[PDB]
Amino acid sequence: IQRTPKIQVYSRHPAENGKSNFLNCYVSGFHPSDIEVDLLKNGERIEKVEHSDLSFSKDWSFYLLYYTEFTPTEKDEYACRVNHVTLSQPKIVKWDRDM
Amino acid sequence: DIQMTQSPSSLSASVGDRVTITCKSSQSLVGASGKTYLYWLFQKPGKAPKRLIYLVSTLDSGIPSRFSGSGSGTEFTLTISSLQPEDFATYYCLQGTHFPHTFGQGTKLEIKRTVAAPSVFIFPPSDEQLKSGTASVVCLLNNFYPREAKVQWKVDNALQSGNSQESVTEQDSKDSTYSLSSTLTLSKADYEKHKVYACEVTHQGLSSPVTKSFNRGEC
Amino acid sequence: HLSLLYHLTAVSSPAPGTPAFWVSGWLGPQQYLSYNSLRGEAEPCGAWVWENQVSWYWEKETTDLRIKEKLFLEAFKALGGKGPYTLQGLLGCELGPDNTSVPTAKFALNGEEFMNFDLKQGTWGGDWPEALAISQRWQQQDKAANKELTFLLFSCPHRLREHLERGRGNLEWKEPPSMRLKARPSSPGFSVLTCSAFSFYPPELQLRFLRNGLAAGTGQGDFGPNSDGSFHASSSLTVKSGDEHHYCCIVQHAGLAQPLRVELE
Amino acid sequence: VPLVESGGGLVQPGGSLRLSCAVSGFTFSNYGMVWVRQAPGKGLEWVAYIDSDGDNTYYRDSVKGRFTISRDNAKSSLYLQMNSLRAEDTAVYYCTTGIVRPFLYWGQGTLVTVSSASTKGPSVFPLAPSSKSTSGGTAALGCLVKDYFPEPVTVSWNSGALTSGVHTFPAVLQSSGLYSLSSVVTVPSSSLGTQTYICNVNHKPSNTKVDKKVEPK
Ligand SMILES: [Cl-]
Ligand SMILES: [Cl-]
Ligand code: NA
Ligand code: NA
Numbered sequence: 106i107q108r109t110p111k112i113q114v115y116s117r118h119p120a121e122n123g124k125s126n127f128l129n130c131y132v133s134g135f136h137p138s139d140i141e142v143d144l145l146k147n148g149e150r151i152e153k154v155e156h157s158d159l160s161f162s163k164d165w166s167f168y169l170l171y172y173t174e175f176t177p178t179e180k181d182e183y184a185c186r187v188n189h190v191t192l193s194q195p196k197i198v199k200w201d202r203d204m
Numbered sequence: 205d206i207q208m209t210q211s212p213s214s215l216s217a218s219v220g221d222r223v224t225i226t227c228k229s230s231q232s233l234v235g236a237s238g239k240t241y242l243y244w245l246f247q248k249p250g251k252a253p254k255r256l257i258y259l260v261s262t263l264d265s266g267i268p269s270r271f272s273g274s275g276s277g278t279e280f281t282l283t284i285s286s287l288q289p290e291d292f293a294t295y296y297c298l299q300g301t302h303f304p305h306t307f308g309q310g311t312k313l314e315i316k317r318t319v320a321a322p323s324v325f326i327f328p329p330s331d332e333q334l335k336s337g338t339a340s341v342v343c344l345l346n347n348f349y350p351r352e353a354k355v356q357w358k359v360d361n362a363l364q365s366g367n368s369q370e371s372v373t374e375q376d377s378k379d380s381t382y383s384l385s386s387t388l389t390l391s392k393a394d395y396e397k398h399k400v401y402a403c404e405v406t407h408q409g410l411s412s413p414v415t416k417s418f419n420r421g422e423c
Numbered sequence: 424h425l426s427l428l429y430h431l432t433a434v435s436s437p438a439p440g441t442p443a444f445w446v447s448g449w450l451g452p453q454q455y456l457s458y459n460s461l462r463g464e465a466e467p468c469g470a471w472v473w474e475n476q477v478s479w480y481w482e483k484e485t486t487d488l489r490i491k492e493k494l495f496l497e498a499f500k501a502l503g504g505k506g507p508y509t510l511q512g513l514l515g516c517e518l519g520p521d522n523t524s525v526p527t528a529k530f531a532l533n534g535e536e537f538m539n540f541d542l543k544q545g546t547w548g549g550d551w552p553e554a555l556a557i558s559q560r561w562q563q564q565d566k567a568a569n570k571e572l573t574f575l576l577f578s579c580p581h582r583l584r585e586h587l588e589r590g591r592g593n594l595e596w597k598e599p600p601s602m603r604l605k606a607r608p609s610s611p612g613f614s615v616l617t618c619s620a621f622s623f624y625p626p627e628l629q630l631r632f633l634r635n636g637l638a639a640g641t642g643q644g645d646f647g648p649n650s651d652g653s654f655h656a657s658s659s660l661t662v663k664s665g666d667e668h669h670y671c672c673i674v675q676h677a678g679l680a681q682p683l684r685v686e687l688e
Numbered sequence: 689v690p691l692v693e694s695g696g697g698l699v700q701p702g703g704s705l706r707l708s709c710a711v712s713g714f715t716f717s718n719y720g721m722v723w724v725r726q727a728p729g730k731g732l733e734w735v736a737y738i739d740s741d742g743d744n745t746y747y748r749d750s751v752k753g754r755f756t757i758s759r760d761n762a763k764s765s766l767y768l769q770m771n772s773l774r775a776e777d778t779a780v781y782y783c784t785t786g787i788v789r790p791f792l793y794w795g796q797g798t799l800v801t802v803s804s805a806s807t808k809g810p811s812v813f814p815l816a817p818s819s820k821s822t823s824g825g826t827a828a829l830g831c832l833v834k835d836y837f838p839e840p841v842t843v844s845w846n847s848g849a850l851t852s853g854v855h856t857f858p859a860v861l862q863s864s865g866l867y868s869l870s871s872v873v874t875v876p877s878s879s880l881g882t883q884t885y886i887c888n889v890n891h892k893p894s895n896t897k898v899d900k901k902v903e904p905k
Contacts, residue, residue, distance in 0.1 A: 241790070243790065243791055245732070245791065247732075252782060252794045252795065252796055252797055253724075253732065253782065253791075253794055254794065255791050255792050258789075258790075258791075258792070264792070296731070296732055298732075298791065300790045300791070303737065303746045304734045304746075304748050305734035305737070305746075305748075306734060307731055307732045307733065307734070308731075309731050310731050310732075323826070323828070323874070325818065325821075325828040325872075326818065327815040327816065327830075328816060328905065329813075330813045330814050330815070330816065330832075330905075331905070332813055332814075333811075333813045333832075333834075336811065340813070340832060340834065342815055342832065342870060344828060344830075344870075344872055346828065346855070346872075346874065369860050369862070371857035371858050371859075371860050371869060371870075372857075372858070373855055373857060373858070374858075383855045383857070385857050385869075385870045385872075387868070387870070389862075416818075418818070423818075423819035423820075423905065
């Protein structure tokens, strides 16, 4: 079977402009395990990006966490771009700072 | 709500016969990696169910290899290639694809043996029973085939109605026969009014219908 | 009480540079182990790198998972056809009361649960045709069942035993969530209130909403992990244009002594 | 022998019961579990299902608010809490597996009987053998067990020392709301006198025990 990914974007610590932090993309609930994910800073790829192991849940669907150290800023928007068999074109979820 | 409906509801067949049971689901049952979650179960009287065939046609371990299943969409069949006498049970089909999760009404499978006549017996309500209000009269039909038999109570030759219950044994698992009690329940007041008491039996194994009788009091 | 569960996954055609096979090991909601076929070696994750541990521990995680690896790739051959397939296994023990260990071994193919390894009758089994294919292929292999029986009845709970004695601080770790409640006009006539919990452990947390002290429901809620092993939770609710401020947020968590009220201030 | 379900019994409408299913046949933690039920002398009926983890459950919607399936993998066993019971819940309740071998493991069931009426022990009356029943030949005799509630009742002859040609009939519900059955036996007419015959009726739900002797009037 096939399952489309859920995507959640948020920061480790509450966002404060100028203070250092981490940005998270949590992709879950998807199958098969093939997946491609970039974090975006104002439209374009963040270079140095780490991720956790591709693991899975009680329902058997997979989950993954992407993250990078960053300093938020008045001038800056961030997003997560995800690609997967179940999507016709990449899904992009904008980071809501409050979330 | 996805109904399972089997054909037939009841069946007597002969040892050696080829048996066919159908199961009609009101909605298709495929819906995975081409896996069909249809199941056949059977149940002997006083016993718990057992699984026969799983998926559509996979025999469970130790199920005699003359049993088989097939079908695909909405149309399913159980097939016993050559009936044997232990095959007696009730069979059920079961869909396990969407909750609920429903059974066919069952097919009761009995085994047909050679025709055999019933030894008839008749019983006076005991002295004791009367004292405590009422009186019960028992007619016994013993060890016979087939199940079908007609019984009549002859109270002073007026054929009684709605005042007698019958019980039938399960087809004996050794000798394939049945047995029946017809029990006529009466009041002490009504029972003492009449004298001629008899049951009359008629059954395929009898060319001439038989009666056993007694007269209230002396023997 | 806690569990020790191994998440096993293999694939019939990995991308180049991707492993065919990889395992994540978990003590409760906390990952202690990593293994993949590329590296071929078991590693601790997080604080567990620094656990005071018997010197042969990660040798014996590695040896067992290499066995598990060969079998999983072997499943594919035995499994008739060209797939691609993905074989997942959930192998672990749970420790209840009385020091008594309950076992678990379930398996899934192309995202569907289809098989299990029974421990009472030392057996692989399942209804699916492909359950039988892998089942007999594993059964017909020398020692498989015995190693499996050993791994889940002895190795597993032993390992859980050792981590509960040697990693007590790690498991008993508690850190309260940093809290924010914020607002944004959703639509004409409406606002969206979002209660957010940052950096908490353990993962178990509940959030409610209150108007003037009396319940207003939970929001629409979501959970997620951070990278340091801590957790994130958030919830959102729709409320009227300008009231709006007779609202607080109620968070419940083990890292607090009492529930915490979060004011929009 | 893979399971044992327990904790059935007789209860009032409105009442409550807790069914236990002790699995020892297989590794219980692997299996979704299912409750299935069978109203006396009728078809099988699906009742409830549970995840192996324990956090997903389904019910037939003639039962939704009233019953509650659950499991304790710790004591490899499975439960049904039934509350607000009514007449139609009467059935033998059977415990089986869900995924991945749905319906493969079974036990002896447990009988749950829901009624407002009280336990009454049966009257026991003998069915005497006929005077005109040949010399030599076969004579039948038995005893009658009347007006009892609930099921079941067991009958034996000469203390378990007579099985040959004994028929105990399936009880039937008399419109009085109570049950009756007969148990009869065929023997050699010549035994009428020499051998003595006694039926052992036991109705446990009311602690009734009758050893009635059968003699010719
Ligand atoms: Cl059976
Ligand atoms: Cl050490
Ligand atoms: Na394995
Ligand atoms: Na399961």
